Amino acid sequence: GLEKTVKEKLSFEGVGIHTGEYSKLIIHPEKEGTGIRFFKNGVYIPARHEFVVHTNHSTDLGFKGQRIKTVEHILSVLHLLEITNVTIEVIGNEIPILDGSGWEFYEAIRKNILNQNREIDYFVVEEPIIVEDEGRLIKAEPSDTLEVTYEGEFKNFLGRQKFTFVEGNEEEIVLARTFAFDWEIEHIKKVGLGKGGSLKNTLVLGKDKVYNPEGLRYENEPVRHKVFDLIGDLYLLGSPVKGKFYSFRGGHSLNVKLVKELAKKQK
Ligand SMILES: C[C@@H](O)[C@H](NC(=O)c1ccc(C#CC#Cc2ccc(N)cc2)cc1)C(=O)NO
Ligand SMILES: [Zn+2]
């Protein structure tokens, strides 16, 4: 495909899920060969694995004393639409969580895509690789198209679920909300996370119920969002990715570990 940017400045705002603090976000058009990067307090933070500063419950980027939390959702949308050249300006400490899914980002960007005139240099997975972490596992292997599978153990009514993204079904994961279990809420609050959490932006899961009045968006909404998360983290490779991925109980830390190992092997 051709490199892509946005045809005008796109604006978004809302609290961050973890900081609970309001952020103003502006997506700026950029020329060919610019890449995806964030901008905060006069500092450009490239959307690349080298700038990752934290990876639990979220993926956070940092550079020159400036930090931006929870970049995975907006990066996933950009990855799905193969937007390659924009600057994501942020006033605040965290990307807005909005409704907890990628819908608002996706709808606005898709509506304002500008095709540019240079072919995309894809990150193509060259060979099979497996990363593990005491039960957790992620495997990557060559594929000319992006395919991403996540399988999880939820230990509640959801049980064991899996979902597979293939190119063409991008919109089957952009509505999947971020989620939390009721048994981890106390811990989340204690370590200073989830301060922006509410039923308006988070799917809250119980043992045999959903705390959200409207219930689930999909019968397998959580694993859909996990795929959505992985695609976001995968874009930290610096280019749109072509490969086949399988994640079992993976998280941001394991996602970034795979990214870093893939980057090292193909540099
Ligand atoms: C799922 C993960 O991959 C990951 N999500 C999180 O880490 C996460 C952690 C905690 C919350 C929360 C909350 C709340 C609440 C609340 C509000 C009101 C009442 N009355 C009671 C509870 C949300 C997301 C993620 O998507 N990363 O991209
Ligand atoms: Zn997420």
Secondary structure, 3-state, the chain: CEEEEECCCEEEEEECCCCCCEEEEEEEECCCCCCEEEEECCEEEECCHHHEEECCCCCEEEECCEEEECCHHHHHHHHHCCCCCEEEEEECCECCCCCCCCHHHHHHHHHCEEEEEEECCCEECCCCEEEEECCEEEEEECCCCCEEEEEEECCCCCCEEEEEEECCCHHHCCCCCCEEEHHHHHHHHHCCCCCCCCCCCCEEECCCCECCCCCCCCCCHHHHHHHHHHHHHHHHHCCCEECEEEEECCCHHHHHHHHHHHHHHCC
Taking every pair of Cα atoms in the chain, the longest distance, rounded to a whole number of angstroms, is: 52
Binding-site residues for Zn(2+): 73, 225, 229
> How much distance in Å is there from the Cα of 243 to the middle of ligand 2?
21
Whole-angstrom distance, CA of residue 48 vs CA of residue 260: 10
Residue ranges covered by each domain of the chain: 1-121, 122-267
Note if 252 is an active site residue: yes
Nearest CA to ligand 1 atom 6: 57
Instruction: Say what the resolution is, in angstroms.
Output: 2.0
Task: Ligand 1: list residues with CB < 6 Å.
Answer: 17, 57-58, 72, 178-180, 185, 188, 194, 197-199, 202, 204, 225, 229
> How much distance in Å is there from the Cα of 148 to the middle of ligand 2?
15
Residue among 125, 78, 73 nearest 243 (CA): 125
Whole-angstrom distance, CA of residue 141 vs CA of residue 127: 6
Q: Of residues 18, 49, 79, 252, which has the active-site annotation?
A: 252
Cβ atoms < 10 Å from Cβ of 176: 26
Q: Which of 154, 189, 193, 202 to mutate to test the pocket of ligand 1 (most atoms within 8 A of CB)?
A: 202
> How much distance in Å is there from the Cα of 117 to the middle of ligand 1?
40
Residue among 75, 3, 74 nearest 33 (CA): 3
| CA 197 to each of CA 13, 22, 180, 202, 208: distance values in angstroms, whole numbers, following the listed order | 15, 13, 9, 6, 21
> How much distance in Å is there from the Cα of 141 to the middle of ligand 2?
23
Give the torsion through C-alpha atoms of 203, 227, 47, 58, to 10 deg: 40
- Specify the CATH class of 122-267 in words: alpha beta
Helix 221-234 × helix 72-80 angle, to 10°: 80
Nearest CA to ligand 1 atom 20: 198
Nearest CA to ligand 1 atom 9: 180
Q: Which of 58, 187, 191 to mutate to test the pocket of ligand 1 (most atoms within 8 A of CB)?
A: 58
What b/e sequence results for 120-155 when a residue is b if at least 16 CB atoms lie within 10 Å of its CB, and e otherwise? eebbebeeeeebeeeeebbbbeebeebbbbbbbebe
Fold of the domain spanning 1-121 = Ribosomal Protein S5; domain 2 (3.30.230)
Q: Do domains 1-121 and 122-267 have the same CATH topology?
A: no
